[PDB]
Amino acid sequence: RSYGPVFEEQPAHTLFPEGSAEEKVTLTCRARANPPATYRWKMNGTELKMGPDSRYRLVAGDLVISNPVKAKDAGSYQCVATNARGTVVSREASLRFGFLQEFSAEERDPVKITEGWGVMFTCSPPPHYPALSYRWLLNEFPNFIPADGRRFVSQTTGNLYIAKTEASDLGNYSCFATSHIDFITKSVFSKFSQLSLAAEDARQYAPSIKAKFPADTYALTGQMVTLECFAFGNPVPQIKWRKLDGSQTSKWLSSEPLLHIQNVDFEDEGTYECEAENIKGRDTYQGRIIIHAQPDWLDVITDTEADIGSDLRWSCVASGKPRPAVRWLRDGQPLASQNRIEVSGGELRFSKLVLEDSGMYQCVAENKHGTVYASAELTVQA
Amino acid sequence: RSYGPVFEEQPAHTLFPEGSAEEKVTLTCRARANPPATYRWKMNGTELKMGPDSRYRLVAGDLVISNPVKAKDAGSYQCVATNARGTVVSREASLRFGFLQEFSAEERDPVKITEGWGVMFTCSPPPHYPALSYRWLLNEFPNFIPADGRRFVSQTTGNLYIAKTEASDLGNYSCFATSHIDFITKSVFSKFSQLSLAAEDARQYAPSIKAKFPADTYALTGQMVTLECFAFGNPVPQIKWRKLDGSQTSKWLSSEPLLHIQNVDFEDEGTYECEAENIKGRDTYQGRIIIHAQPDWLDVITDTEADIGSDLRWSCVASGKPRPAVRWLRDGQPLASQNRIEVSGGELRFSKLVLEDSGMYQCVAENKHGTVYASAELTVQA
């Protein structure tokens, strides 16, 4: 029998590695239907101008863009499936471009500090997207500086921190930055800056946390979260982490500059504290982790066959934080209250259906973190 | 001038290939000194009973064992260098014996499975040491089964996995095991088990990971790590690996059943995920890699000449994970707090030295993964 389009595959957010031999990018879309559906792609809300003289070409629903470039192709794409019965739109997919420029060719400033004092070297990474991973080189590639408790590289800024400088630190320093996309990895490093040391200060001193984490970190359920904390101090301080709670018993989560929380959930929300300590004293720093969640369906609409003149009750309920807002679509178009149709939140109610109400409908749930779609075909029969 | 023993060559862990024409094994040891030092070897803490009627013989410090056998020679050996000035002990060296027995002579059980289903053949390797490398033979040697994505041999168990059985799999199967020690290689293979197939199931099905890796893998810095993952599925699934991180961008490390990480360091610690996918669905499995490190010296004692009645400050600092514990030795004997000697961790302090305190001293740093030694000669002069 004949039935409206039903998505089996929708476009996914895509990051295209600039430069790669690949001279084109494809956005997937497939909808089963009877008769088979036809497709149309929209970018930033506007339909794509196809044709032989166009950079776009379709391959059974999938959109193919030749010679992709950010200046012209970066944006949000949507797939529209249509057939005799009706039309439904797909989730939107963002197309972004990855890149990593070299550091500047300018020589880097030297640093002179009293042996014993801690010091921070600034990376100043070049333009790039998406975020990079960082390491530092001593004198030459590939002499990377190990994470040995006294030397730490922030993965947020790329800056190198030495808790207590020592004579062995004399040398030149370079920031090494890496971009990893799919299976492709590209690294670039800066010119080297010379570290010299003034007469030593052998006096011990209490720790002072220099590298910290945000006052507020927002993460989504299922995501992984990493917080950083590093201090200067003599002797080299030791770092410990804990989550504040009612319990008055000692509980530690990490004994390293980094605190990792896998597959976070709502229970992980709270205030976390980093403690840096040595025989001279201690320093602490606190910040919060707030847990939100992308929308997800709890209840959705399903194909319904009703008799003409009848009243129908349709609804969609979605979870998420912040609480998502539900809206509706009719054959790919926004559906609002009207003659015999009342749209209030996730509830759609028809008053005395008409043979013409038949078609494809979709309820959309959205919040600051994402959007989800649910579709169904309504068949009003006399 | 006269000075205590100083090691130039210490014994190394040794694996002796049983059977080899070599009818003796040698453990190296050499210490420079004035006058030249004398040597003594200890096994499992007890000194070796030398002599002409003994299986042991010395060759300028090196220990030579005639007709080595596990039942009597397997153990930990230590070299002791001594001269007028004092005594120092060497790092310990383990002597182990390599072997590989044949598989049992018993016939192997046949296997019958529905064509389309995946299947696993159990190797059940015979007694051996150290770990072997594995392959499987089809019908006869040397018809090895290639790693073609559909057929995989676990290097942990030696088991053969076929992701989706097909008519071409009909035949007999044997587990081929290889021991490689130094330049010597020895392989043995099992009798063959017959694979027969029942009427085919042509229906496709989502992947299911059957061969996995440990929930927790501990590796040492500089070491190489290999993780395995293989699934049954129709169509044959494709495997992909990634390390979980804060970054929300797609990053893959391998597109094969094996994931190899060369020269691991602390940054490689984390949770890794194997994904098996085909057009019907996907399966995943996660496990962790934890990075530790053998002790290494940061600061050690050096020959010191102090005046009688003087106070001396000696210390040794070592890196490593878990944090190593430092202990001391005086002329090869455990040194603990006493009259004028206070031993606290890696620090040794004498209160008003005496002409008799002169001698050889050693600080030892140890953790679950290894031990390191540092020595120096103390010369108390009036």
Curated annotation (Swiss-Prot), chains A, B:
Localization of this protein: Cell membrane
Covered range of the whole protein: 28 to 409 of 1036
Role description: Axon-associated cell adhesion molecule (AxCAM) which promotes neurite outgrowth by interaction with the AxCAM L1 (G4) of neuritic membrane. Contributes to the organization of axonal domains at nodes of Ranvier.
Gene, per the UniProt record: CNTN2
Residues bearing glycans: N44, N172
Family statement: Belongs to the immunoglobulin superfamily. Contactin family.
Organism: Gallus gallus (Chicken)
Intrachain S-S bonds: C29-C79, C123-C175, C229-C274, C316-C363
Domain Ig-like C2-type, first and last residues per copy: 5-96, 101-196, 207-290, 295-379
Record PTM: The N-terminus is blocked.
Name of this chain's protein: Contactin-2
